[PDB]
Amino acid sequence: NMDLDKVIRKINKKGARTVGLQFPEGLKMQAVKIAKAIESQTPATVIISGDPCFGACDVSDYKMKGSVDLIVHYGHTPLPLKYEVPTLFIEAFSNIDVKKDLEKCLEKLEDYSKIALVTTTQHLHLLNEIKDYLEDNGKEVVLGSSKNTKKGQVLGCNFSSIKNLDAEVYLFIGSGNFHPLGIYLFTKSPVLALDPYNSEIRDISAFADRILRIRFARITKAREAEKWGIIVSSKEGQYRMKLAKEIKKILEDNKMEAYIIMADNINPDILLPYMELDAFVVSACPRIAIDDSQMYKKPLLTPQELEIVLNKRQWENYQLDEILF
Template identity: 60%
Template sequence: MTNYQFKIEKIIDQIKSKEAKVVGLQFPEGLKIYATDLAREIEEQTDTLVLISGDPCYGACDLSDKEMEGLADLLIHFGHTPLPIDQKIPTIFIEANYQLESMKILKEALQHLDGKKKIGLVTTTQHLHLLEDAEHLLEENGKIVIMRAGTGTLKGQVLGCNFSSVQDLPVDAFLYLGSGNFHPLGIKLSTKKTVIIADPYLNQVRNIDEFADKILRIRFARITRASEAERFGILISSKEGQSRWELAKTLKKMISKEGKEAYLILLDEINPPSLMPFMNLDAFVVTACPRIAVDDSKMYDKPILTPQELEIVLGVRDWENYEMDEIKY
């Protein structure tokens, strides 16, 4: 039995109304285990053939519409809300809401918010439906809850590459409902405010400060090492939702202005094997998903920088003005 709602009735209705003959299914990594069950259910209830995308999926920025064009009539993308990017085939987004068994984790989080009156409540796509109940619980305990939509995000929603919903929010602290550390890290670095995580998967409440300090030390070491680099590779994603071609060209000019070499490299998947042919370069700058440089840095032998970190290397930005990279949609 799963804690996720896949809205199978809605999916079946959409397939029938669009008279789709071949339906593509795409899932983020954590939801792929449900792919074959959903495919079987769809094929049993409709006269369609289901095609499952087995490639990695990092978000709504990483649709398999291009790969399925000419194969599928309709793409069902699970786990994310749509971004303002063009789609090659009709695409339906299913949030795959996570069902929280109780609000106990939020009640525990309140103990970490003593002395904090105005609370920014934030989460990711899978938990957006829980925000209203969470807001009521916080207000019943004397908190003032402040939420807003961002550029390309819904009210109270953050993405791994978009923290516009929390920037300049007049709050004393943030309460993040969800798993992992990357999103809370982005909130912390974007706002410099206290960030408390209520993690329903680990059934754990924690402050992001210790993790943020650890990551900043790692990033400082990468920047320091890259300051000696003379030859840079600028990595550009072929994924439409992650492609920042104009930024890549700007970074190349910035590097060349300092008398260093820069090479533009286009990739669909950015990982250690894909960079092996370019190990004659000293460092790389990622213009694709910001998580590649921060989350995966230990996987690479050479420094992998964000565009803002390159600015620090080149003396264009001070370390004290460090900030997370974001993709503006």
């Protein structure tokens, strides 16, 4: 839910002639309704950023620079990124009825006493309710926090907050099964996910088996590769040029060729012309390699997976990629 009255508050204060709107693709179809309201209530012209947008890493402050005086960005908690354009982050808390999914969750959590909670931007508002519920039903509830992440909150490349909980089980609240996968990989504890959208409850160790094996296969094919591509992103929150250049030197030290490729959105199509390159390392978002591996013919590896390739980490010690600041 879009927090329109607050957006309006901020627009009118800061005297906007022109306002940009940013959404993940999941929220874009509310851009017209919001643009229509703001243009009705203020003298401002609304510019919808029509750009595909994954996260807080993906602010179009360079694209919208000069075109809009303020950016309203929905669905994300801001990162430690130094915003050029004035920006308002609206979390857009879930339009949900969480209620008689609580008892179902309790049912599946019978075996466990000390529980860690994890959730995402859109469900932050539900933490306390569910924490106090579990406590009044005999559970001990621990919520992680960290430098970047609020109490109980995580991101796809910021799992720091749940590294040090020592809970016996972890309950993730929400959809997106990258998050529970990350929880499972880092904690190596049983992990349940409640998807409050369609009421699905599930163990993520199951879904990990078959993904880990796929990653393994990827890695194994990559062991044959003699020419590598190293993908970096022009997205401000994905930009890891330092790392990319370190990886290049590493691969060259292992007497292989490697070439740095920089792009905004990464997709299979944009690797298609580099036919001499036999595999790729992602020096941008850790999710790309993991979530979209089925879309790429050639192996796409996280930097951790490349470590495995080079035998400078064991498969024993597989680790997701994380994006620090």
